[model samples]
Target: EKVFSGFSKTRENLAVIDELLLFWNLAETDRVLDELEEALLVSDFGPKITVRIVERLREDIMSGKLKSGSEIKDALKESVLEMLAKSKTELQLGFRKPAVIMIVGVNGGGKTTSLGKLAHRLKNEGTKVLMAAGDTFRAAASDQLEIWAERTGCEIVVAEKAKAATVLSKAVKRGKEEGYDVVLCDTSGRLHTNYSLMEELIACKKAVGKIVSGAPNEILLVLDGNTGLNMLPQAREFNEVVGITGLILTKLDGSARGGCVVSVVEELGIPVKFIGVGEAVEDLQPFDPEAFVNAIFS
Candidate 1:
């Protein structure tokens, strides 16, 4: 409910389709499809995916396969769902004693903040959660993450004046000995294209893995949902550097553009782990395809 409300822009913007298709027939199909193309373009689906959807729908209509507005709407939903069907959105933890999750993203991308809620969710989900403050590059980065640790009541490992990799190494060892269910490791936020930062990320992954075999179970890349168009490039850059296994799309609350992520997941085929729909702790939702389309598209 909270997530659906925030995606009002997507629903409202695409509302025209519902209305246009209401009194539709074969004669006016072209006009309605044209309007549909424009509406999708303005909704941030971008030119490529939006046009492809429009063209597909046009084919369905012109071929006499889709004869009713209800069919068109369903087809549109199917079109959106088709792109997201391949994604595996659930958070994966290993079968071992301690599962490691690494978070990586650039500055102001809600990297640390999301970890706080995630740790809370993990702890509440019947797993004993521990956090590692591995962000050593930015000053006060650990401080903010520490605050989250305190808020979530999860144990934290911090090397305030130490390297991120060093903190991870220690955290992994502690997690193994202490029998923590999951270790949420926070890495220094850096530009994806930076060679030094990329190398640092690789080392951190290895740092966690070296301690526990098959460690760093999940590498989730946090992204700003409203940062449209350039979103894919940003995600891919980080994926190349950190080997992102999933995504967390943040800052989608109170915005009208809900379809921006379509192009991203479609292009990269990376599953979205979660979405930060609101500021509340419970608003961080697991990605759902059918529910997502109904909320934003309907």
Candidate 2:
């Protein structure tokens, strides 16, 4: 069964593309490029990347590189794809026997659930995985991870009411000493603007490094796909504070603004490593660039 069966609705995808095409067709001439710029801005591509893209498009038109609106679609797609490719950094399993991944995001961005899905996938891949419930501030967060652990049959280290960074330190030490293959650290979901909470994330990374040389191999930033235009600012804020290594976009099936994918890749220079298509464990899929573009325009 397809994990995204109910989530990936065709109607929503078509609506977003139709909106994009409408903006493209409204102005067909080189002079209409300004109109195109306005359309992308309205679509939540954000100003920084939008201006850059529009400038590039104008240059292509002036150089006789782009001749028509339909041609513009291919050009835009190529530009977005290239940008994402440049930011692409695959997860590196370091010399540490158990690769450590610290997942972080704002509240209600599906942070805990994504960790469950990731742990399930890793265990199925024949890797001995352990989940650390480091979201000590939220009482329920630990229970949530525990439920997923029972379901996935993976080991979990819980820290019910301790500091997040300390929890990670303990998990890293255990994983290394016990010879675990992977450690997935879950942090309490906090707003990006929360200075204290954000500092905790930074501390967690530092603690992991001190405990295990070159640990915390991956710092995956999770965001809701339905967040749409808001994603640009969120990406900027989170990256500025924590330095995300990659992104996992959730709720792709629920949002009509899949175009944010293009905006994010272009603006932040961070490749999307996984897409959350549904609520199931299997819904988290390894990001395939071609498949994503095809799904968007299909």
Candidate 3:
């Protein structure tokens, strides 16, 4: 309920759909569908996906398949669900122990906070987790992650003025020696425009892979859901450099434009593993595309 409930803001934005679909019939198809298109665009679904959805509904209505507004609304929900269903939503943790998941994103994008919440989730799942404080650029970054380690009761490797890559290597090495199941590395948030800082993430990936071959099992880019259309370019650059396997969309509770999730997934073809809905430890929700789609209309 918490996860789905957080999208009330989005549901409100889409509430116009419910109204537009009311008292509808064949003669009202054009006007109703036009308003539906506008509602989706207002919610930040982007021009392409929005047009596709409106077109699909329009075609169905013209074909006499969608005779009622209720049917059209359900079909619209199905269309959105189908778009997200194409990607993998689950984590790709293999049978190997000490799986490394490096979290990366732009500044103030909730990288460290999401890492802590993920650690909390992993620890609760009975998996041994080790956190790597790899964000050395910002002052007190290690201390911020340290509090989470203590909160989650998981082991941590704080970078004592060491490189982010070095910190990740040490953490992974310790995870192996200590029989840890996962090592979550927290790296400094860098804008995609900062080429040099972004390049450092490659070093971190290489450094950890050296210690454990095929390591850094998942490089999740933490994206702010409010970024809307901009997330597409940001995701492209991050995927190009770090080969991000998954995404963690944050601050959905504070955002009214949850349709950006659909935009990002449909455009980039990358699966979202998690979403940060609220400030609580449990607010970092595992992404369920069906539930998410339903919530938009709920």
Candidate 4:
């Protein structure tokens, strides 16, 4: 229900589709389709996907498969849903003793916030969580995570002066030795354009693996939903270097054009594991494809 309300702005932007379909006539199909395409574009579905969805509907209408406006709308929703349904949305943490999750993204993409909320969720599920302050590049990063540790009642690992890779390696080692269920790592936020900084993430990942085989089981990229289509390049860059396993789309409660969710999934083939609907600790909800699609079209 939170996700449903989060998409209110996008739903409002797409409300005109109801009126557009209200005057549906086969003779003016081209005009109606053109307007429908525009509506999709306005919702930030991006050009390529918008065209593809419209072309399919055009063919269906010509083949007498789609006979009415409501039918066309149904097909449109299905197309969007299919795009997102291709990838795995759930966190596929292997059945290891201690699962290590590495969080990465550009600056202010809600990496820390998402990490904290995930820690809270994991702790509530009766999982023994360990918080690792791996964002050594930023001052006071550990302090922020420490607050989350205290709030969640999860143990945390912090060093006065240390490297990011070393911090994470030590945390994973501790998790394994201390009988922890999950080790949630928080990494320093950096732009994808920073080649050296991006390479550092590779080092951090290798460090975790060194301690435990196939560790850092899930590398989730925290993407700000407000960035919309612009998030594509960011996702591409990070995926190229560190191999992103999934996505955590934040700030959807404030973004009007939630259509970017489709663009990111279609372009990168990465599933959105979770979405931050609000600022509350419980606001970070698992991605529900049916709920998301229904939210926009209902």
lDDT agreement with native, every candidate: 0.84, 0.76, 0.87, 0.89
* Candidate 3 lDDT, 1-298, residue by residue in tens: 6656667788888988998888688998898888888899888898999999999999999999888888999999999998887766888889888899999887767888899999999889998898999998865667889999999998889877568998999999999989989999998765445877777898999999999989989999998887878889989888887798999988876467878888888888889899988889999989999898888886
Can you write out model 4's per-residue Cα lDDT over 37-118, one digit (the tens) per residue? 9999999998989999999989998899999989988998999999888767888877887999999887767898889999
Off by over 4 Å in 3: 191-193
Q: Write the per-residue lDDT of candidate 1 for residues 57-95, one digit (tens) a residue.
A: 889999989989999999999998898876568888858
Order of quality (TM-score): 4, 3, 1, 2
Candidate 2 lDDT for residue 116 = 93
Ranking by lDDT: 4, 3, 1, 2
Q: TM per model?
A: 0.94, 0.86, 0.95, 0.97
Cα error, candidate 3, residue 69 (Å): 0.9
Q: Could you say which candidate leads in lDDT? A: 4
Clashes of each: 1, 0, 0, 0
Superior by TM-score: candidate 1 or candidate 2: 1
| Residue 83 error, candidate 2, Å | 1.8
Give the Cα-based TM-score of candidate 3 against the true structure. 0.95
Top candidate when judged by TM-score against the true structure: 4
TM-score of 2: 0.86
Model 3: lDDT of residue 233: 93
